[PDB]
């Protein structure tokens, strides 16, 4: 199932919900410990992790360095060791069962820093920083390489992307996307990095493009039906799902599904309520 | 509001 964690609607949320794309059902599960929006989710060894974000509430706006683990057969959250710094609007990738925490903000500070989490040893350790300061960065894993895509450095919204080589611990800039995208949804489908939606400093976007490593080229595909940034994204059974986000006026509960063989999007459900900035993953 | 995420500033 497609799990959605945290998010934001009037305040940061503790929601944990699961969508089943064959029966159209939604399942409510254990509330997050601390409310969170601007976080990212990943699944490592079946379990579900929530990384970074912040608690934007009527009484505070605390950037989070927390990492927390949800077990789908115990329905329980348990805290894991925190990161070195708070990471609001973070991006995460999983290479070889390790969690890479990328970018994000703490207050005014936009991080280029990156750190790796070891689930068998409950430790965080820094790795090499990015070339660029990125918040709202989209992360993907392709051929056990890590891609940081788009985002916001504090001044400019970014179409650039850079690649992290784990066995060399270095970052190389690559071909920039066609579109500037901060808070896009970024994932891997077929063997292309997909970049869906986002914000460019003027408008939310409904366009979608994908990166092919072999040719080092970005090419557009069918646009979503609804402009959105700060969306959740995941691929379930060779199809792309995008969840919620903000269209500049509304918090979307729209869930669109992209079929790569017809290059078609279509709305497959509504979340229980519109929200932005969730973390998403599948298990 | 943040133009990108919608959150209150």
Q: Which of A101, A212, A103, A214 is nearest to A150 (CA)?
A: A103
Task: Name the residue range of residue A236's domain.
Answer: 1-283
Question: Residue A18 has which token pair?
Answer: 């699961």
Buried/exposed A51-79: b ≥16 CB within 10 Å, e otherwise: bbbbbbeeeeebbbbbbbbbeeeeeebee
Number of domains in chain A: 1
**Interchain CB distance below 8 Å, A230 and B3:** no
Strand order from edge to edge, sheet including A192-196: A185-189, A192-196, A208-212, A217-220
Resolution in A: 2.2
At A205 the three-state DSSP class reads coil
Cα separation, A135 vs A137, whole angstroms = 5
Residue A107 CB neighbour total at 10 angstroms: 9
* Whether the Cβ atoms of residue A89 and residue A101 lie closer than 8 Å to each other: no
DSSP-assigned letters across all residues of A256-267: EEEETTTTEEEE
> Are B6 and A136 within 8 A, CB to CB?
no
Cα dist from A94 to A102, A187, B2, whole Å: 11, 12, 29
Other Cβ atoms within 10 Å of A263 Cβ, number: 10
Q: Do A182 and B4 touch (CB under 8 A)?
A: yes
In angstroms, the CA A210 to CA A240 distance is: 12
Q: Which residues of A are less than 8 Å from B3 in CB distance? A: 199, 201, 248
């Amino acid at each position: 199932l497609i799990y959605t964690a945290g998010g934001y609607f009037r305040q940061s949320l503790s929601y944990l919900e699961a969508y089943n794309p064959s029966d159209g059902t939604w399942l409510r599960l254990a509330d997050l410990q601390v409310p969170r929006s601007g976080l990212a989710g990943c699944v490592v060894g079946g379990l579900l992790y929530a990384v970074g974000g912040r608690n934007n509430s009527p009484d505070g706006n605390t950037d989070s360095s927390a990492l927390d683990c949800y077990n789908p057969m115990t329905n329980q959250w348990s805290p894991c060791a925190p990161m070195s710094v708070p990471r609001n609007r973070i991006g995460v990738g999983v290479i070889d069962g390790h969690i890479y925490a990328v970018g994000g903000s703490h207050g005014c500070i936009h991080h280029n820093s990156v750190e790796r989490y070891e689930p068998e040893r409950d430790e965080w350790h820094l790795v090499a920083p990015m070339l660029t300061r990125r918040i709202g960065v989209g992360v993907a894993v392709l051929n056990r390489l890590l891609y940081a895509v788009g985002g916001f450095d504090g001044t400019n919204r970014l179409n650039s992307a850079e690649c992290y080589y784990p066995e060399r611990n270095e970052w190389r800039m690559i071909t920039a996307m066609n579109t500037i995208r901060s808070g896009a949804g970024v994932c891997v489908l077929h063997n292309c990095i997909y970049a869906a939606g986002g914000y460019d400093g003027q408008d939310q976007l409904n366009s979608v493009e994908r990166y092919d490593v072999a040719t080092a080229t970005w090419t557009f595909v069918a646009p979503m039906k609804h402009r959105r940034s700060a969306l959740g994204i995941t691929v379930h059974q060779g199809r792309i799902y995008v969840l919620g986000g903000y269209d500049g006026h509304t918090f979307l509960d729209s869930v669109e599904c992209y079929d790569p063989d017809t290059d078609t999007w279509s709305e497959v459900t509504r979340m229980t309520s519109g929200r932005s900035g969730v973390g998403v993953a599948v298990t | 509001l943040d133009e990108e995420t919608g959150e209150a500033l």
